[model samples]
Target: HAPPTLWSRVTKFGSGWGFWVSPTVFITTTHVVPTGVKEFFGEPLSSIAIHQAGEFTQFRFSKKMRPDLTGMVLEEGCPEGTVCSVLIKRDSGELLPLAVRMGAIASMRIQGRLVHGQSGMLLDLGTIPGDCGAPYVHKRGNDWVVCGVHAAATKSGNTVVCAVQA
Candidate 1:
């Protein structure tokens, strides 16, 4: 089981795209406008379902722990058929989230615009508050896929107002 280190209580909207996945590789967009980044619509968030809060109530934060995590390939694929998805396997026969990372897929806008449902989509269950730099993934019929990695948030207030066409 991967220990929760970089995981911090994101306090509603502390950072990144509050935990979500997309249609392609597991990642967020972080308002990647003016740059023409559209792969997000093709992937899904590399999402990881964390144990219930009570399960980690006594959770211990590694004091000397570095803000870095060492693991397998995070961005296994990109730019087409080369992009791969993220997955997690546990000893308990239960599924879990893997600790992967990226620089900034934090906040995204549908078609270069932010919307109400978009925030909900980004943080399906909440991101940075406890899932910064996490990968977002997509799940399909008998298959799981990735879209982008967790990223930091730009503005505050978990209130999204419109719907982006992305």
Candidate 2:
């Protein structure tokens, strides 16, 4: 199960999702963000809004991976399905926790973007819209650590993919 405290860290960005890695840094998928925001991919600039709880907050777009990849970082910065969790926000404004099983490490593409070799995790279940950028986390000892970012689902809807992070 995901801890309640972690729920507060995930937020809605556009129609997708994002999560705080630090007090000021947020992370999300590059494609889900707007064009203007993409211009500042790896640079720091303050001009993006993210919704959390019931309020919207502005943050800077700070870092990002290469254009062909799926991640973007803003100032800040899991593992395998031994059963991990992803917290997705519903349109009704409710937080939904989804459990996924770890498959294996592999390379895949989502929306034409690459999740490079050994940098992606395959999940047994599929994910839905607005799930992009959600954190994939698992329990390590007694602490829950984030292992990847929700990127895409196979066309058949039977598998989900994420970009792994250290």
Candidate 3:
């Protein structure tokens, strides 16, 4: 089980999720962000605040990238059946944790852009609309490591097709 402290790293942005990479750097999926909001890559904004723990913290938009789908290889990194977890905020404003199993380390396209580097992975868990940008974490040694951010999901056969931004 992941410790409670990880919850502090996640925040609710509108109906989606976002996490802090640093005191000033926040990360979230591009699709979750509304189109009218100014971005760092386009234009600058004064500041934006996200909801967390019934409070809000102001932050500036910095950067955004979409994953590349072509030439993606399903490799043996992280194994096939290793268990992991994802952190998401429910519509009720409550933080929720869900168990997921690692499927494969691969790359995928999101928002029709190619994200350089190994940018995605498949997880064996069902996620909802508000789950975008949720942190996918795994236990490493004695600490928890943030592996990726939840991006999209669909139903395939008897399994839930889930993808994450790595």
Of models 1 and 3, which has the larger TM-score?
3
Candidate 2, residues 1-166, lDDT tens digits: the string is: 7655677777677667777655545666655665555533345444444432111123434343222232223211134336767667666777767777766666556556656312232444446876777876666677666655677776675566655532
Worst 10 residues of 1 by lDDT: 51-60
TM-score, structure 2 vs. true: 0.66
TM-scores for candidates 1 onward, in order: 0.25, 0.66, 0.60
- Which predicted model would earn the best TM-score? 2
Model 3: lowest-lDDT 10 consecutive positions: 66-75
Q: What shift in Å separates residue 160 of candidate 3 from its native position after superposition? A: 5.6
Q: What overall lDDT goes with each candidate model?
A: 0.27, 0.56, 0.51
Structure candidate 2, residue pairs in collision: 63-73, 78-146, 78-147, 78-148, 81-102
Evaluated at residue 99, the lDDT of candidate 1 is 28
What TM-score does prediction 1 earn? 0.25
Better of 1 and 2 by lDDT: 2
